[PDB]
């Protein structure tokens, strides 16, 4: 900022004016704008050099919003650490960024990238038989590290329980800890002989995502983020196959554990001799020299009370050293107790796979020092164009609340407030009409409802099935399998159990009469349930995602806050004030005033 005349309207911009820097002569070619103060990056995807720019920016930046034309990126310390990790240096990053920038990079930005691009590889952590040695080839630097009281060629054994403490501490200190494991060199750990089946073929983006993890030829821990239905299961299977070591899979739910077992079997050469599932249904353990063990977070994470039969298997899990560990649905690892899974199980390489890297609290960033940096990410819109994930036309139906119903809403307390608008008679009519209309088109409809009471009430009235916690595992699986392969049972209701980590290609439409409090994770996960429809490549096909809300209620506030993640990724919500053809429906629930009054009394009697 020198020899620059402030603009007359510069007051409109609160010190964010960047007119002092002059536009480059070749600005018509460069696709990037760099904001000095905020560090934001504006990228034009319709200009030359778009494709490789997007790949480069994603590597060095964490995407914020990616609409059709203008992509908004941001640079953070964690993003820079991930970039330098995958075979990159400050010299290359600076040259590329300056080359692609429509305007010269400010000195403030240059300092930010420079600082965090030099600490890559000073401190290393390795795992011997069952003892963790935080060693390094050089001897002088570690001596400085050891002097610190927080931690407690040089190699020293560190307490297994306190491993997380040092990992965070290394992040706090200038030098962050690196997680690399040369699976080719070490053969002491028994090797599992497995390879992808000849029929199987890796998709382009799946190949690229796995390439980043193995860019240097050695496996490195990290998190791979792909849209729901992208195929993270196959990415994990391929990652396990290439390492050729023992692999342990931790999964959110037992139903998904079965999916991993089947998916693993369908897409690799492994035989049942080397597969064992440590789930509630059965505690079978593999006796082979090495193999795959798939379990769930609750079983491994549990500390106080675990049965002796489960204890023996858990001791078996903790006994042998493992080569690979897949943390499926890694968005719940930062939970209070699930963090112990990483520490208890000793694995050289840990890979996290999730579709929605979102968490209400500030614990999402902790993943960078529990598993590894965010290695790769994919655009939801980009995959939709390629035909890998079915297109969805999201909508947010506005259901007005009737006067009799609304008056009781105001007087009631907050906790009782939820049940008034969830059981809105107008909302009930909207749900019935949408289901009837979309059932005519031969479309499978899944109706999520977090409120169990409302879920059951809607299901009983509509004569349709439902799944939630009380339902046993056998019944839940039977409904899932039946709904997939039976014409009569075209629609099934669900609850919070089915929100995340379930595969069902048949589902194409989707509704939510009720939902949990404002939380972007559940919205994205529920939307992803219908993003893998098998009939996604058919010409002129569009899946549907309906969100029923009550006007003037707190649900409107939550719904707007509950779809922020989808808006950032690219999805757009359309407001449907009027549903055409609803009046002509011969039968509508709670049409008569007496029925509405009876329902109001019934719902009020709940509390």
């Amino acid at each position: 900022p020198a020899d620059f005349v402030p603009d007359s309207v510069s007051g409109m911009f609160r010190s964010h004016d960047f007119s002092y820097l002059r536009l480059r002569p070749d600005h018509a070619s460069r696709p990037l704008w760099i904001s000095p103060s905020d560090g934001r990056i504006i990228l034009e995807s319709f200009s030359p050099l778009a494709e490789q720019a997007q790949d480069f920016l994603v590597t060095i930046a964490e995407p914020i919003s990616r609409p059709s034309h203008i992509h908004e990126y941001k640079i953070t310390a964690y993003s820079l650490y991930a970039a330098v990790s995958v075979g990159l240096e400050t010299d290359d990053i600076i040259s590329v960024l300056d080359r692609l920038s429509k305007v010269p990079v400010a000195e403030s930005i240059i300092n930010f990238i420079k600082g965090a691009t030099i600490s890559y590889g000073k401190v290393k952590l390795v795992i011997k038989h069952n003892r963790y040695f935080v060693e390094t080839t050089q001897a002088d630097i570690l001596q400085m590290l050891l002097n610190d009281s927080v931690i407690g060629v040089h190699s020293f054994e560190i307490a297994n329980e306190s491993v997380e403490v040092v990992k965070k501490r290394c992040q706090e200190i200038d030098y962050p800890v690196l997680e690399e494991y040369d699976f080719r060199n070490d053969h002491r750990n028994p090797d599992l002989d497995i390879d992808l089946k000849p029929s199987t073929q890796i998709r382009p983006y799946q190949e690229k995502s796995l390439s980043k993890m193995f860019g240097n030829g050695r496996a490195r821990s990290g998190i791979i983020v792909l849209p729901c239905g992208a195929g993270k299961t196959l990415v994990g299977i391929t990652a396990a196959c290439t390492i050729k070591k023992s692999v342990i899979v931790l999964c959110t739910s037992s139903v998904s554990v079965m999916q991993w077992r089947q998916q693993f079997l369908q897409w690799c050469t492994l035989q049942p001799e080397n597969c064992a599932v440590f789930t509630s249904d059965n505690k079978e353990m593999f006796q082979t020299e090495s193999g795959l063990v798939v379990s769930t977070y609750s079983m491994v994470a549990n500390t106080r009370n675990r049965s002796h039969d489960s204890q023996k298997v858990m001791d078996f899990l903790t006994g042998r050293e493992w080569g690979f560990i897949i943390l499926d649905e890694v968005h719940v690892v930062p939970a209070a107790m699930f963090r112990r899974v990483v520490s208890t199980i000793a694995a050289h390489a840990k890979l996290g796979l999730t579709a929605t890297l979102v968490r209400e609290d500030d614990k999402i960033g902790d993943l960078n020092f529990l598993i590894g940096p965010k290695l790769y990410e994919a655009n939801w819109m980009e995959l939709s164009q390629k035909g890998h994930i079915a297109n969805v036309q999201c909508a947010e139906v506005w259901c007005p609340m009737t006067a009799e119903f609304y008056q009781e809403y105001l007087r009631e307390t907050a906790r009782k407030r939820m049940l008034l608008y969830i059981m809105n008679p107008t909302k009930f009519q909207a749900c019935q009409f949408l289901i009837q209309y979309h059932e005519r088109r031969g479309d499978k409809i899944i109706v999520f409802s977090d409120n169990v009471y409302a879920l059951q009430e809607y299901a009983l009235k509509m004569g349709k099935p439902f799944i939630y916690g009380s339902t046993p595992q056998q019944e839940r699986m039977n409904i899932l399998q039946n709904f997939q392969y039976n014409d009569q049972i075209n629609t099934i209701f669900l609850s919070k159990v089915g929100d995340t980590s379930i595969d069902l290609p048949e589902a194409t439409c989707l509704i939510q009469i009720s939902s949990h409090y404002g939380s972007r994770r559940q919205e994205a996960q529920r939307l992803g349930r219908i993003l893998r429809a098998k009939r996604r490549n058919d010409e002129g096909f569009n899946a549907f995602f309906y969100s029923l809300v009550s006007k003037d209620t707190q649900e409107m506030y939550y719904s707007t806050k509950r779809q922020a993640f989808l808006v950032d990724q690219g999805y757009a919500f359309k407001v449907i004030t009027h549903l055409h053809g609803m009046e002509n429906i011969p039968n509508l629930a709670y049409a008569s005033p007496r029925e509405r009054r009876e329902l109001l009394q019934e719902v009020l009697l709940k509390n």
């Binding site: 050099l49 494709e51 490789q52 720019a53 790949d55 480069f56 995958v86 075979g87 590329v96 080359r99 190949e207 796995l210 390439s211 980043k212 993890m213 193995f214 860019g215 030829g217 290439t242």
Partner: protein, 374 residues
């Protein structure tokens, strides 16, 4: 046995790292080289063309968006308009190969509206079956029989398939076509075909340049436009003769009268100079005394073919220029490397690039030559 993942990262950005006016001139000169050679080849102004279109399963392919059938039909409409504008005296007929048989869709006549309407109706028809060159050629051979001898028989097959299912020996038809002096032009769509090449070569006195296969959507229009112009005739072939014709006079009448051609009430028409019968439109054979009625303008349109304007040669940069502005349109020649001046040989007057294209495509007389007093 390591996979491609372990090798390295692609590093796409590494691939990208950080004279036109003369190029256009030399490119124009290379293109102008093909136009340098031009001689007044004798061409048959009067012609009868039978347009054969392939409507078979091969048309359902999406090589030409939206489908081959749609693009061929659409460009056929344009060809019909262009063909009858450049050649007013000529007559045309339309045939289509469908369901393994040749189906006639419009009788050979000289009315462009009838042919345009026939093609428009074919739009909805869904192509199916296999094509049959022999059936189309046999039907075309019959159609070109009543045509007068002085007329030059012509067949323009738009073939799209790769195989032909005929009921008989197609080689006999090729010999028969040569006997009747019928020249066949084939516009293939996918790849060369042995029979198609033989048919064109045999009927065109051994010339192999009458069988063309396009390479993209754009090239199709150029191939269609080329067939509009009349074809040259060989020295050995003789068809010199006179044709009786008359020029009727437009007549204005207060009360409508019956037309001899269509027996319909029309306010105006052209009175024949032999039988005084009125005809709605021109140029058509008189319905009563069967002498082709035409206006002087119809003959005029074809004069430029007989005596084409000689191509212009770009002046060398070293040599001096006649003037600083274009003779015709008075547009200053840009100062620029290589002078962009073209002079006509006969009158030696420079012209601009816009005039050079205009004076040889739309306007068929050099402005300088007419201005020169003899």
């Amino acid at each position: 046995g390591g996979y491609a993942w372990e090798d390295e990262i692609k590093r796409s950005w590494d691939l990208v790292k950080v004279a036109s006016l003369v190029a256009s001139i030399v490119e124009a000169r290379k293109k102008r080289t093909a136009k340098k050679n031009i001689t007044p080849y004798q061409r048959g102004i009067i012609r009868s063309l039978i347009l054969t279109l392939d409507c078979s399963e091969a048309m359902l392919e999406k090589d030409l968006r939206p489908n081959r059938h749609a693009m061929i039909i659409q460009y056929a409409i344009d060809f019909v308009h262009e063909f009858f504008d450049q050649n007013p005296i000529s007559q045309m007929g339309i045939i289509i190969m469908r369901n393994g048989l040749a189906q006639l869709v419009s009788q050979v006549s000289g009315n462009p509206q009838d042919h345009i309407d026939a093609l428009k109706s074919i739009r909805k028809q869904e192509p199916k079956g296999n094509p049959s060159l022999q059936n189309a050629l046999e039907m075309a051979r019959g159609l070109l029989l009543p045509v007068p001898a002085h007329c030059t028989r012509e067949v323009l097959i738009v073939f799209g398939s790769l195989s032909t299912t005929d009921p008989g020996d197609i080689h006999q038809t090729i010999d028969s076509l040569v006997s009747e002096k019928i020249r066949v032009k084939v516009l293939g769509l996918s790849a060369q075909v042995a029979i198609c090449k033989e048919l064109c070569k045999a009927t065109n006195y051994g010339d192999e340049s009458f069988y063309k296969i396009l390479l993209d959507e754009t090239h199709l229009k150029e191939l269609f436009n080329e067939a509009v112009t009349p074809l040259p005739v060989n020295k050995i072939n003789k068809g010199f003769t006179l044709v009786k014709m008359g020029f009727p006079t437009r007549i204005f009448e207060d009360t409508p009268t019956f037309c001899s051609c269509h027996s319909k009430l029309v306010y105006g028409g052209y009175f024949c100079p032999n039988c005084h019968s009125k005809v709605c439109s021109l140029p058509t054979v008189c319905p009563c005394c069967d002498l082709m009625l035409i206006l002087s303008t119809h003959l005029a349109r074809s004069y430029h073919h007989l005596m084409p304007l000689k191509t212009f040669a770009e002046v060398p940069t070293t040599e001096k220029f006649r003037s600083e502005d274009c003779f015709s349109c008075q547009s200053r020649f840009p100062i620029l490397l290589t002078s962009s001046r073209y002079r006509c040989e006969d009158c030696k007057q420079e012209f601009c690039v816009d005039c050079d294209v205009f004076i040889h495509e739309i306007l068929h007389n050099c402005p300088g030559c007419e201005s020169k007093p003899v």
